[PDB]
Structure formats: structure tokens, C-alpha cells
Design a protein around this ligand. Structure first.
Ligand SMILES: O=S(=O)(O)c1ccc([NH+]=C2C=CC(=C(c3ccc(Nc4cccc(S(=O)(=O)O)c4)cc3)c3ccc(Nc4cccc(S(=O)(=O)O)c4)cc3)C=C2)cc1
Length: 444
């Protein structure tokens, strides 16, 4: 729906589909507050959370409470803005705290948002909340739609420059400023170089480099990865999309258990719109693609589920069972992103990961990398077996100081990236996870 759901006598979960800026996260809550309700707005971004608070006090004479992982500001106002992570850090809902609870960007598929939303969905009513709103500008199942200012031209085989099974006719990049999207930070160099060697001024671009490496004037063909901003100065004439992106995915490769790496999946609606949106700003744009079909938005990998249990164990003092109750509340609620139901599986997996090294965990938590609990656990297992990590990549930095006293094969519990060192598959925990996969009628 495009209108703020009225407040119900008892309870209700409603949906709010509105664009960013129409005031769905500010004006809407302000109205609920003018009515005497106490409102809590959750968002994935610290910046956004701050953005709403500023807007509110500056436009509606209301200095709302703002809560983030860094700190919380309390003004005693009836409106409160918090990040999902801080909300969870806080234990979730607090009795008699809020009448309404809006879950903004509820289409987000990062583990913190999903877990946070599950939490709201499960505790809201017990918490005395009368209403829970699932707000978002990108409803699940969305598809890229036609834009009034963008001409979409499909790539064909004709063209000297080969491009993902299709071709890029030189004619289309000779003159003007064009943005080409490639999936791998490498594939970029492969293209920028082929075009530079054809008279075409092309400057590659991917994570690491600087914005400066992109002249702001004169013809140019920028071959980049999604590293390029979404709000950065577009002013592009045409964008060529490879229609594929790199994303985190879980593979039950039975070697010995599972693998969580980054794979290239077909691009989805949200992705397609964002890349296409890099053209036709203040003028008419061109959009060339290799593939028309796209996966609708609102779908996420099983590995995010894993990421949710990992987080419940690492930061929120949540047993794998508690996480499940919360994640289940999320899967039973229609209108939110979907994923294969692997709750039982992941639950049983983390449950077996007991007696984790506190110091290692604390090291992975603040280190900031993904899956701090699984990294720390694989390390705990390693140290206890005086074995080295699967690799000496930054991932395993918490084991650097014992490097000397670590010999023999690595007791691989699972694969979280490149595994160089030799590996043994005889560890009880490895055997425990292997069995978790066999005990499942939807896993293996
Ligand atoms: O819908 S509503 O009508 O209710 C409404 C009302 C008011 C709104 N205000 C906003 C204000 C700011 C922002 C974001 C933001 C974007 C850029 C920012 N830039 C600064 C630049 C210079 C100085 C500052 S300073 O000094 O911190 O004040 C900030 C700051 C904040 C900001 C924008 C997009 C963001 N995008 C992300 C995209 C991907 C991932 C993330 S993540 O960090 O992973 O959460 C964030 C993050 C932050 C978003 C919204 C917004 C909406």
C-alpha cells in the first residue's frame, strides 16, 4: 500500500510501499505521533537513521531519540529512530515502549535487517505494540520497469568487442561518456585494455582505486564493478550492463561440509535498475544489456541465514534456537524477502559449535569481518589441535601469534574462502556438521 496503515484496536502487520523521500520514514511517523502514539523506526543504515533525525527536528519541530551502535540520544520524544543492529543489541522489543514499529527498507537482505525484523515480528504483540509496518521502496518480487528517459537497446552478436556472449559494437562507445558494468574486478582490465588498444580511451575501475582515476570531462569509457557509487555524479550517456553480479553463496559441496564464498549470479531487478539509473539524468540515456530476463527482487541466499545464527551467537547472546524463533517469524510473514527454509539445518549446526574461544571470538567480532563466530570457531578448533588455519589470509589474523606452534593438517570444519594448507576430515565437529546435512530432508 501507498498510505500509512491506520492504528488497529489490537494488532496487525501492514505494508507500506512508498519511495524514499515521500516522507514514509519521517512524515508518516510524525503523523502517528501527533495522534499520541509512540513510534519506533528501524533502518539498516546508521547514516539514514541520523538523516531522519536531522530532517525531523529541522522540519517538524521534533527532536527524536536516535539510537545506533555508537551511542543513543534520548530527548524523551514520542518518535525514536534506531538501526536494526542497535535494536537487537538492545534485546529487541521492550514492553510498553512503542505503539507503532516501522521496519524501513524491509526488503533489505542483510542478516541484521532480517534478524531484526524477525525479532519485531515475534515480540511486537507481547511487547504491547498495536502496529508493525513493513516499509520499503522496493517491494519483494519487483522487476525492473521501463523508465521515461532511458532507451534500452539489447546487445546482439554483431560487434568487434566480445562481451559476455554478446558483442559491443565500437560505434556505440566511440565518442561520449559511457559506463560499462562487469562482474569481476579483473574482467574490467580485460576490457579497458582491449579498448585502449583500439584507440578507445577506456579507464578501468573497481574496489580499491580512487574516484579521481575517472576524468570528469572528455570522452571516456569507464569499465567498472558495482564499486561505483549509486549517488555519485552520473551524467553518463549510455550504460552497458553485463547483467551478472557477484554475491555471497552457500554450497553444500560436501568437502567435507559446506562452502561460503562469492559467486556470480544472474543480476536481479534492484541491481538492474541501479546500473541503468547511472544514465539519463537530466537528459535521455541509453541502456545496453546482454540479458533481458532478471531475477525479481526480494530473494536471498541460505548463507544469510547462516549469517543470522552467526550474529545471534556473536553479538546478541542468542541461542541458535532463539534465533530460529525470530527467523521463523520472518518466514511466515508474507510480503518480505524469501529464501529456502534451512532454519532447522543452520540451528543444529551452530548448536554443536560449543565452547568457542572467547578471546578468538572477541578478536573476530571487533575485527569486523563476516561470520566472526565461524571464523573464531574454526580457529578455536585449530588452536586446540595445534593445527594451522586453512590459510594465513587476513581472515585468520587472530591466529598469527601462534603461527610458530601450529603444525600438521588443518581440521577443516568448513570452507570460508581459499583453503591452502593441507586438510584432515576427522574432527568431531566436522563429523557433527556433516551429519547435520544428512539429518536434513531438504539439505542433502
Ligand atoms: O523517506 S523519507 O522521506 O522519510 C526520508 C527523510 C529524510 C532522509 N534523509 C536522509 C539523509 C541522509 C541519508 C544518507 C546519507 C547520505 C550521505 C551523507 N553524506 C554526508 C555528506 C557530507 C556531510 C555529512 S555529515 O557531516 O555527516 O552531516 C553527510 C549522509 C547521509 C544515506 C542515504 C543512502 C544510504 N544508502 C546506503 C546504500 C547502501 C548501503 C548502505 S549501509 O551503510 O550498508 O546501510 C547505505 C545511506 C545513507 C539518507 C536519508 C531520507 C529519507
Amino acid at each position: 500500500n501507498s498510505s500509512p496503515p491506520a492504528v488497529p484496536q489490537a494488532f496487525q502487520v501492514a505494508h507500506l510501499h512508498a519511495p524514499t523521500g515521500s516522507g514514509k520514514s519521517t512524515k508518516v511517523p510524525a503523523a502517528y505521533a501527533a495522534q499520541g502514539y509512540k513510534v519506533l523506526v528501524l533502518n539498516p543504515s546508521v547514516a539514514a537513521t541520523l538523516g531522519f533525525g536531522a530532517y525531523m527536528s529541522k522540519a517538524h519541530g521534533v527532536d527524536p531519540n536516535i539510537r545506533t551502535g555508537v551511542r543513543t540520544i534520548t530527548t524523551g520524544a514520542p518518535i525514536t529512530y534506531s538501526t536494526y543492529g542497535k535494536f537487537l543489541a538492545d534485546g529487541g522489543c521492550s514492553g510498553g515502549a512503542y505503539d507503532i514499529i516501522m521496519c524501513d527498507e524491509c526488503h533489505s537482505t542483510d542478516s541484521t535487517t532480517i534478524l531484526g525484523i524477525g525479532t519485531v515480528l515475534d515480540q511486537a504483540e507481547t511487547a504491547g505494540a498495536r502496529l508493525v509496518v513493513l516499509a520499503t521502496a522496493t517491494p519483494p518480487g519487483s522487476v525492473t520497469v521501463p523508465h521515461p528517459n532511458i532507451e534500452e537497446i539489447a546487445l546482439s552478436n554483431t560487434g568487434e568487442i566480445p562481451f559476455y556472449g554478446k558483442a559491443i559494437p565500437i560505434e556505440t562507445i566511440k565518442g561520449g561518456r559511457h559506463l560499462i558494468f562487469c562482474h569481476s574486478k579483473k574482467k574490467c582490465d580485460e576490457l579497458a585494455a582491449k579498448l585502449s588498444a583500439l584507440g578507445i580511451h577506456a579507464v578501468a575501475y573497481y574496489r580499491g582505486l580512487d574516484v579521481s582515476v575517472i576524468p570528469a570531462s572528455g570522452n571516456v569509457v569507464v569499465v567498472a564493478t558495482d564499486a561505483l557509487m549509486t549517488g555519485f555524479t552520473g551524467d553518463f550517456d549510455s550504460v552497458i550492463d553485463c547483467n551478472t553480479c557477484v554475491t555471497q553463496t552457500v554450497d553444500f559441496s560436501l568437502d567435507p561440509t559446506f562452502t561460503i564464498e562469492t559467486t556470480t549470479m544472474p543480476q536481479d531487478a534492484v541491481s538492474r535498475s541501479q546500473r541503468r539509473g547511472r544514465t539519463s539524468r537530466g537528459r535521455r540515456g541509453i541502456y545496453r544489456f546482454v540479458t533481458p530476463g532478471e531475477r525479481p527482487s526480494g530473494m536471498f541466499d541460505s548463507s544469510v541465514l547462516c549469517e543470522c545464527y552467526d550474529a545471534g551467537c556473536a553479538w546478541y547472546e542468542l541461542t541458535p534456537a532463539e534465533t530460529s524463533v525470530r527467523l521463523r517469524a520472518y518466514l511466515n510473514t508474507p510480503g518480505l524477502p524469501v529464501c529456502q527454509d534451512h532454519l532447522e539445518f543452520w540451528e543444529s549446526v551452530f548448536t554443536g559449535l560449543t565452547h568457542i574461544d572467547a578471546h578468538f571470538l572477541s578478536q573476530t567480532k571487533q575485527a569486523g569481518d563476516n561470520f566472526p563466530y565461524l571464523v573464531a570457531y574454526q580457529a578455536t578448533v585449530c588452536a586446540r589441535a595445534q593445527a594451522p588455519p586453512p590459510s594465513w589470509d587476513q581472515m585468520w589474523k587472530c591466529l598469527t601469534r601462534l603461527k610458530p606452534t601450529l603444525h600438521g593438517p588443518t581440521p577443516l570444519l568448513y570452507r570460508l574462502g581459499a583453503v591452502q594448507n593441507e586438510v584432515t576430515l576427522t574432527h568431531p565437529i566436522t563429523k557433527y556438521i556433516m551429519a547435520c546435512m544428512s539429518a536434513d530432508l531438504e539439505v542433502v
